[PDB]
Amino acid sequence: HWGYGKHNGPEHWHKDFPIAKGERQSPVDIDTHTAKYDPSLKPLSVSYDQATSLRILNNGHAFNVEFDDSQDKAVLKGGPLDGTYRLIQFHFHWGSLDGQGSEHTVDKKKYAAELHLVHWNTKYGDFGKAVQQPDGLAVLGIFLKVGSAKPGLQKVVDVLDSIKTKGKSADFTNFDPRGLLPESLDYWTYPGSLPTPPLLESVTWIVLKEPISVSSEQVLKFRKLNFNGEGEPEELMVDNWRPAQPLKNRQIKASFK
Numbered sequence: 001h002w003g004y005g006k007h008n009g010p011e012h013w014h015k016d017f018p019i020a021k022g023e024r025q026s027p028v029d030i031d032t033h034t035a036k037y038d039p040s041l042k043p044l045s046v047s048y049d050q051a052t053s054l055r056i057l058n059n060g061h062a063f064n065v066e067f068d069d070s071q072d073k074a075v076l077k078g079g080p081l082d083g084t085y086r087l088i089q090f091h092f093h094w095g096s097l098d099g100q101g102s103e104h105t106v107d108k109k110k111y112a113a114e115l116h117l118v119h120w121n122t123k124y125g126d127f128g129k130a131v132q133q134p135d136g137l138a139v140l141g142i143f144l145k146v147g148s149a150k151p152g153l154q155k156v157v158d159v160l161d162s163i164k165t166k167g168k169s170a171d172f173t174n175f176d177p178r179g180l181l182p183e184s185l186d187y188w189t190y191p192g193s194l195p196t197p198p199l200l201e202s203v204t205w206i207v208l209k210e211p212i213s214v215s216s217e218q219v220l221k222f223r224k225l226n227f228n229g230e231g232e233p234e235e236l237m238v239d240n241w242r243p244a245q246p247l248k249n250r251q252i253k254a255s256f257k
């Protein structure tokens, strides 16, 4: 089974998933000198007012917070998108040290972690069907840098000891994802893929320009989780990010001048 550790890491993924070497893989480096402003781009509309969180779990690669996606409560529209996209889950990628951890980079610079809010295109009926379509998913990417604590993140941090090892889960209601957004919604966008197997090229990436600040103590809690399940040998969940992939024939557009 795939992972991030020397013998089963990103460099090996192609053997089981040949799409790893596709034409639209993620993440990529965002080159600001090459990213072009596109006047056709509409502003993002993020409606998270009635978001309904359900639970949080350790799946062996990250921890995901899942939401009720049965109704058009927490949805993303506008920007480069055609329809309505429902929020299904969010999770992070982070490093062993503060100087690395993000998947996307900006002018080659890495952040401490990256937040992914995953949405699926309602016209397909459910995530399982959406995930296989080129316009199936929209992922909002937000960079984290170390500084002042993010008050909206604390509820997540405080529950992590409860899902330390793989397969562990816990109820997690009333979490409001608006507390994880930066002030500005200026963004870059490009067509890409899921950055974990099965690596399907079905994602429209929306990467926010403004990072959010989190504290060292908050990020340290991420680093104490385990890739391994209970009873198995300890393996800290760190550096669960895929390196930048070739841009190839794609163009990154900017919503801002």
Ligand SMILES: [Zn+2]
Binding pocket: 091, 092, 093, 116, 195
């Ligand atoms: Zn992710």
